[PDB]
Amino acid sequence: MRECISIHVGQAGVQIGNACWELYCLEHGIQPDGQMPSDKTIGGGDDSFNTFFSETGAGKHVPRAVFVDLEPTVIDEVRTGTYRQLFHPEQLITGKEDAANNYARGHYTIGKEIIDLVLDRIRKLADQCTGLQGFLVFHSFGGGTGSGFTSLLMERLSVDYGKKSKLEFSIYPAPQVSTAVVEPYNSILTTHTTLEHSDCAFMVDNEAIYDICRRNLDIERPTYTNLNRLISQIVSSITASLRFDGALNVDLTEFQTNLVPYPRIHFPLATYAPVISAEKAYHEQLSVAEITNACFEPANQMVKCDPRHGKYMACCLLYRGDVVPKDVNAAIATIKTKRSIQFVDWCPTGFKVGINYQPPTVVPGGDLAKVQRAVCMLSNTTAIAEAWARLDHKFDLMYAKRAFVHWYVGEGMEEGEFSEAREDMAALEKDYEEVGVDSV
Amino acid sequence: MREIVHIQAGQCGNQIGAKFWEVISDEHGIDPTGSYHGDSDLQLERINVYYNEATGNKYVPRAILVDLEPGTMDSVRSGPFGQIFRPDNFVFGQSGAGNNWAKGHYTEGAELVDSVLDVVRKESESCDCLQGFQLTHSLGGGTGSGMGTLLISKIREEYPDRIMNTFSVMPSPKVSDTVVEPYNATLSVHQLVENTDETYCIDNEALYDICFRTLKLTTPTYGDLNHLVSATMSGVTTCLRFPGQLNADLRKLAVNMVPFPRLHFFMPGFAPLTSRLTVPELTQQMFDSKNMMAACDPRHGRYLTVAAIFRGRMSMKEVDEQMLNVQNKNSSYFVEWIPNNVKTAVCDIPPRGLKMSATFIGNSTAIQELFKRISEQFTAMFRRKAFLHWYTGEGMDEMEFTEAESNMNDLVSEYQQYQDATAD
Amino acid sequence: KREHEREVIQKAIEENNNFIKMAKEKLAQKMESNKENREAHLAAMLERLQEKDKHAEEVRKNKELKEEA
Ligand SMILES: COc1cc2cc(c1Cl)N(C)C(=O)C[C@@H](OC(=O)[C@H](C)N(C)C(=O)CCSSC)[C@@]1(C)O[C@@H]1[C@H](C)[C@@H]1C[C@@](O)(NC(=O)O1)[C@H](OC)/C=C/C=C(\C)C2
Ligand SMILES: Nc1nc2c(ncn2[C@@H]2O[C@H](COP(=O)(O)OP(=O)(O)OP(=O)(O)O)[C@@H](O)[C@H]2O)c(=O)[nH]1
Ligand SMILES: Nc1nc2c(ncn2[C@@H]2O[C@H](COP(=O)(O)OP(=O)(O)OP(=O)(O)O)[C@@H](O)[C@H]2O)c(=O)[nH]1
Ligand SMILES: [Ca+2]
Ligand SMILES: [Mg+2]
Ligand SMILES: [Mg+2]
Numbered sequence: 001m002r003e004c005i006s007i008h009v010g011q012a013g014v015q016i017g018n019a020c021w022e023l024y025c026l027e028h029g030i031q032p033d034g035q036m037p038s039d040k041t042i043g044g045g046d047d048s049f050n051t052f053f054s055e056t057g058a059g060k061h062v063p064r065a066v067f068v069d070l071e072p073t074v075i076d077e078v079r080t081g082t083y084r085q086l087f088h089p090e091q092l093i094t095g096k097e098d099a100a101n102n103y104a105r106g107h108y109t110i111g112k113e114i115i116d117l118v119l120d121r122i123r124k125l126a127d128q129c130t131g132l133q134g135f136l137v138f139h140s141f142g143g144g145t146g147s148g149f150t151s152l153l154m155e156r157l158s159v160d161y162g163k164k165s166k167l168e169f170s171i172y173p174a175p176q177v178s179t180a181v182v183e184p185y186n187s188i189l190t191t192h193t194t195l196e197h198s199d200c201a202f203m204v205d206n207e208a209i210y211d212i213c214r215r216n217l218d219i220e221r222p223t224y225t226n227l228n229r230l231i232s233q234i235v236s237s238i239t240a241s242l243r244f245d246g247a248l249n250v251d252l253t254e255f256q257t258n259l260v261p262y263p264r265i266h267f268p269l270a271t272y273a274p275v276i277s278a279e280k281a282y283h284e285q286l287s288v289a290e291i292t293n294a295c296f297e298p299a300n301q302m303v304k305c306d307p308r309h310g311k312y313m314a315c316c317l318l319y320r321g322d323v324v325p326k327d328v329n330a331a332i333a334t335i336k337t338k339r340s341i342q343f344v345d346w347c348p349t350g351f352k353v354g355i356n357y358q359p360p361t362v363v364p365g366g367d368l369a370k371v372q373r374a375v376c377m378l379s380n381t382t383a384i385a386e387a388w389a390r391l392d393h394k395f396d397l398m399y400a401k402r403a404f405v406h407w408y409v410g411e412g413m414e415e416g417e418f419s420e421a422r423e424d425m426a427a428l429e430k431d432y433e434e435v436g437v438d439s440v
Numbered sequence: 441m442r443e444i445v446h447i448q449a450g451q452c453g454n455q456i457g458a459k460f461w462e463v464i465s466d467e468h469g470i471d472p473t474g475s476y477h478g479d480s481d482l483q484l485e486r487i488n489v490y491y492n493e494a495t496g497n498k499y500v501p502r503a504i505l506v507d508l509e510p511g512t513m514d515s516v517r518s519g520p521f522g523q524i525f526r527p528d529n530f531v532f533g534q535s536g537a538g539n540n541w542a543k544g545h546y547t548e549g550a551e552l553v554d555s556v557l558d559v560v561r562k563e564s565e566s567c568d569c570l571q572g573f574q575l576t577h578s579l580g581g582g583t584g585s586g587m588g589t590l591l592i593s594k595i596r597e598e599y600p601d602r603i604m605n606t607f608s609v610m611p612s613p614k615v616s617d618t619v620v621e622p623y624n625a626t627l628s629v630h631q632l633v634e635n636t637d638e639t640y641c642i643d644n645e646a647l648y649d650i651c652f653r654t655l656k657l658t659t660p661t662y663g664d665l666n667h668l669v670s671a672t673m674s675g676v677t678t679c680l681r682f683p684g685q686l687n688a689d690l691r692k693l694a695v696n697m698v699p700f701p702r703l704h705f706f707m708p709g710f711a712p713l714t715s716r717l718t719v720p721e722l723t724q725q726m727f728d729s730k731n732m733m734a735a736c737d738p739r740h741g742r743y744l745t746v747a748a749i750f751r752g753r754m755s756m757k758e759v760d761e762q763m764l765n766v767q768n769k770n771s772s773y774f775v776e777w778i779p780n781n782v783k784t785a786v787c788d789i790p791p792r793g794l795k796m797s798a799t800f801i802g803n804s805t806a807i808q809e810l811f812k813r814i815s816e817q818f819t820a821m822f823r824r825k826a827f828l829h830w831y832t833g834e835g836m837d838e839m840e841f842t843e844a845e846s847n848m849n850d851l852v853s854e855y856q857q858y859q860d861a862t863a864d
Numbered sequence: 865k866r867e868h869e870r871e872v873i874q875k876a877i878e879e880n881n882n883f884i885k886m887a888k889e890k891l892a893q894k895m896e897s898n899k900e901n902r903e904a905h906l907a908a909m910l911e912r913l914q915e916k917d918k919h920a921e922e923v924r925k926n927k928e929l930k931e932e933a
Contacts, residue, residue: 096441096569101696108899155890175780180692181699181778181783182696184779220757221757394779394780397776397777398699398777403699403778411902412897412898412899412900546920546924546927601906833930834923836926
C-alpha cells in the first residue's frame with residue numbers, strides 16, 4: 001500500500017538514481033543482491049520500505065523503479081555494475097541514438113519510438129501495486145532526453161493514470177558542468193510542457209551543489225559523482241517519511257498540502273544541513289539548533305536565490321536522527337527571533353515539522369561525514385522565481401537571434417512552441433510576483 | 441556503437457587521410473596489420489567509432505579511399521599502414537581530373553561516383569547506428585574538390601538524417617602554383633555551405649606560415665604541413681574517439697557549434713606548435729592567432745561558439761580557472777547573445793610525444809577573412825573570364841560561376857551580420 | 865443534500881476525465897503536426913538534391929551538344 005514508482009530519465013536522472021538507490025539499500029540494510037536479512041516476511045509485506053521496494057519469493061527486494069535513456073552507455077554501467085542484481089532487466093530500458101541535447105528529438109523524433117515500451121514497463125510495476133500513490137520522475141532540464149522525453153512521458157502518464165500524483169526531481173543547469181549551449185531552450189520547453197502535469201517539483205541547481213561541494217567539502221573540482229552523492233542525501237531526506245515510519249514522522253503528502261497554495265506554485269526550495277567533511281566533523285557535535293540555523297543560510301540551498309529578498313508561503317522542516325521536539329521548538333523560537341523570516345499575509349507563519357529517528361547514512365568513499373542528526377528544509381518562497389528569471393534571460397538572448405532554433409525546426413517543431421513556452425514562463429514569473437503582494 | 445564512415449578523396453584527401461589513420465591507430469594501440477597491442481582499455485572503449493572488427497580480433501578502418509588517379513592508391517597501399525585498409529574499399533579511375541572541378545563533379549567523377557557509393561552502402565549497412573560521415577579532401581584540386589562535393593550530395597540523398605562532416609584543405613599561392621585553385625575552391629564552397637553540417641577549414645596558407653615563421657622551416661614540404669593537419673585532426677576527434685561528456689558525437693558537436701545552418705565553417709587551432717607547458721600557457725597559445733589552422737585573426741571578428749579540448753594529465757581546476765580567465769579578459773571577442781558558448785573537455789590520454797596539448801575549434805566571424813581572400817583571387821580571373829574554356833568545355837555555364845561567387849559573398853555578409861549584432 | 869453530494873463527486877469525475885481527454889487530444893495534435901513538419905523539411909531537402917541531379921544531366925547534355933560542333 002502507498003507504493004511509489006521512481007522513473008529515472010536520461011544520464012542525470014539515471015546516475016542520480018544510482019546514488020539514491022544505493023543509499024536506500026544501505027539505509028534499509030539491503031544487499032547488492034537484493035537480500036535483506038532483517039526482513040522476516042518473505043515474498044512480500046506491508047512495511048514502510050515496501051513503498052519503494054517490492055519482494056520476490058526468493059527474498060529479493062526489488063526497487064520499484066524504471067531507468068530510461070535513449071542511448072545505452074549510461075544504463076549499461078548499471079547493468080554490469082555493483083547493483084546489477086538489484087534490478088530486473090526489463091526495468092532498464094535503452095535506445096541506440098540519443099536526443100543530442102535536443103528537446104525535439106527527445107519528445108518527438110527519437111522519443112516516440114520508445115515511449116510505448118516504457119509505458120508498458122511502468123504498467124508492469126503499477127500492476128504489482130495494491131495502492132499506488134504516485135510517481136517520482138528524475139531528469140535533467142538541459143539534456144534532450146531529460147527535457148524532451150520526460151515531457152512526453154509526463155503528458156502520457158497524466159492520460160494513463162489520470163491525476164495520480166507525479167513529483168519531479170529536476171536538475172537545473174549550471175555552466176560549470178553543462179554540456180550544451182541550448183540547455184536554456186530545453187529548460188523552458190520542458191518546464192512549460194510539464195507544468196500542468198506535475199504536482200510538485202524539487203529543482204536542483206547544479207551550481208548550488210557545485211559550490212556546496214567546493215566550499216563545505218573542500219572538493220577542488222566536483223564530479224557528477226560528488227554532486228550525486230550530495231543530491232541523494234537530499235532526496236533521501238525528502239522520501240524518508242515514505243520509506244520509514246515513526247510516531248513523529250510526517251508523510252510527504254502532508255507537507256505538500258502546505259507547500260502548494262496554487263497548482264502552478266509547486267516548486268519548493270530545498271536546504272540541507274549539515275554538509276561537512278569527516279575532518280571538520282571530528283570532535284564536533286552539531287546540535288539541532290546549529291543545523292536548523294544552517295537552513296536559513298542561502299549558501300546551503302539547492303537553488304541559488306535569496307529568500308531574504310522574497311516572501312515565504314510555507315516552511316517545512318524534515319529532521320532525521322537524534323532529534324526531539326523540545327530542541328526543535330527551541331531552535332525555531334530562536335530563529336524566529338534572530339532571523340527575519342517574512343511570510344505573505346495570507347498564510348500562517350508556523351513551521352511544519354517532521355522527525356524520523358533513523359539517522360543519516362553515508363556511502364563508503366564519500367566525502368560527507370556521518371552525522372548523528374540532519375535536517376532538510378522545504379520552503380515555498382517567491383525567491384525561487386529567480387531561477388526562472390536567469391534561465392529566461394539566457395533564453396531571450398539566443399531566441400532574439402533565433403540561434404540554434406533550426407536544430408529544433410528541422411526535427412518538426414515550430415517557432416510558435418518557443419514563444420508559447422516563453423510566455424507561460426513569463427506568466428509564471430508574474431504569478432510569483434502576484435502571490436507576494438499584500439492583500440487589500 | 442555510433443559508427444563514423446571515413447572517406448578520403450583525391451591526392452590531398454588521401455595523404456592527410458592516411459596520416460590521420462596512422463596517428464589515431466597509434467593512439468588506440470593498433471598496428472599496421474590491424475591487431476591490438478595496447479596498454480589501456482580506454483583505447484578500445486569507443487574503438488568501433490572508426491574501426492570495424494574482423495575475425496581474429498583485427499581492427500579495420502571504416503575508411504573509403506577514392507581518386508580519379510590510380511597513383512594515389514598504390515602510394516597509400518605501399519604506405520606504413522597501407523595493409524590495414526580494406527582492399528575492396530579502394531575505388532579509383534585512370535584518367536585523372538587534372539585540377540578541373542567540372543571533370544570531378546560532372547564528367548569523370550560522375551562516372552565513378554556510383555562505384556564509390558556501393559562501398560559506402562556496404563559499410564553503412566553493417567553499422568549498428570551510423571552517426572555520419574567525415575570527408576578529407578582539398579578544394580583547390582579537381583577530384584577532392586569536385587568529386588568530393590559530388591559524393592557529399594549523393595550520400596546526403598541516401599542518408600539525409602545523418603551528419604556530414606568535412607576536413608577541407610584550402611588552396612594558397614604560397615604552396616601551389618596552379619592558378620585555377622580559386623575557381624575550384626569557390627565552386628566547392630558553394631556546395632559545402634548547402635550540404636555539410638560542419639566543415640573544418642584547413643588553410644594551407646596558415647600551414648605554410650606556421651612551418652616557415654614559427655617552426656622555422658625554410659622550405660616546407662607537404663609532409664611538414666600534414667604533420668600539423670594530423671595533429672589537428674587527432675585533436676578535434678578526441679571527444680569522438682574516447683569516453684567523454686562534451687561533444688561525444690557528431691550531432692552533439694554540431695548542436696553546440698552551429699547556431700545557424702550555413703555558418704558551419706570552423707577555425708581549428710592547436711598547441712603547442714613545436715619543432716626542433718603550463719595550463720595557462722596552453723590556454724594562451726590555443727587562442728593565439730599564430731596557432732590557428734586558418735589564416736584569420738580572431739581579434740578581427742567575434743566567436744559565435746568555441747570547443748576547447750585539453751589532453752594530458754593536468755589540473756582540471758586550473759583549466760576551468762584559465763578558460764574563465766580568457767573569456768572575461770577577452771569578452772569583447774565572444775558574442776554576448778549566446779551565453780556560455782565556450783565548452784571545455786579534458787581527456788587524460790595525451791597525443792604521441794607530448795605530455796599535454798590543447799586543441800581549439802572556433803566558429804568565428806573572422807573566418808570571412810579566409811573566404812574574402814579566395815573571393816579576391818577568384819574575381820581577378822573571372823572578371824576577364826580567364827581559363828574558363830576548360831570548364832565550359834565540360835558543359836558548365838557562366839551563370840554557375842556567378843552563383844557560386846554570389847553565395848560565397850553572402851556567407852561573408854552573414855558572418856559580418858552576426859559579428860555586428862548586439863543583445864540590446 | 866444527497867443530490868448535491870452526488871453532483872459534487874460526478875463533477876470531480878467529469879473534470880478528471882476532461883483533463884485526461886484534452887491532454888490526449890493536445891498530444892495527438894502535437895505529434896501529428898511535428899510529423900508533417902519534419903517530413904516536409906526532409907521532402908524539401910531531397911527536392912533540392914534532385915534538382916542538382918537534373919542540373920547535372922543538363923551539363924552533360926550541353927557538353928555532348930558542344931562536342932561535334
Ligand atoms: C600561361 O598559361 C598556362 C599554361 C599551362 C598552365 C598554366 C598556365 Cl597559366 N597554369 C600555371 C595553370 O595553373 C592553369 C592549368 O594548370 C595546370 O593544368 C597544372 C598547374 N599543370 C599540371 C601545369 O600547368 C603543367 C606545367 S605548365 S607552367 C605554365 C589549369 C588547371 O587550369 C587548367 C584547367 C582547369 C585544366 C588543365 C588540364 O590540367 N586539364 C583540364 O581539364 O583542365 C590540362 O590537361 C591535363 C593541362 C594543362 C596545361 C597547360 C594549359 C599549361
Ligand atoms: N547533478 C547531475 N547533473 C547531471 C548529471 N549528468 C548530466 N547532468 C546534467 O544534465 C545536463 C545534460 O543532460 P543529460 O542528462 O546529460 O542528457 P540526457 O538526459 O541523457 O539527454 P541526451 O541529450 O539525449 O543525452 C547537463 O546540464 C548536466 O550538467 C549527473 O550525473 N548529475
Ligand atoms: N596540406 C596538404 N595539401 C595538399 C597535399 N597534397 C595536395 N595538397 C593541396 O591540394 C590542392 C589540390 O590538389 P589535389 O588535392 O592534389 O588535387 P586532387 O584532389 O587529387 O584532384 P586532381 O589532382 O585534379 O585529380 C593543392 O592546392 C595542394 O596544395 C598534402 O599532402 N597536404
Ligand atoms: Ca517483507
Ligand atoms: Mg544522454
Ligand atoms: Mg590527383
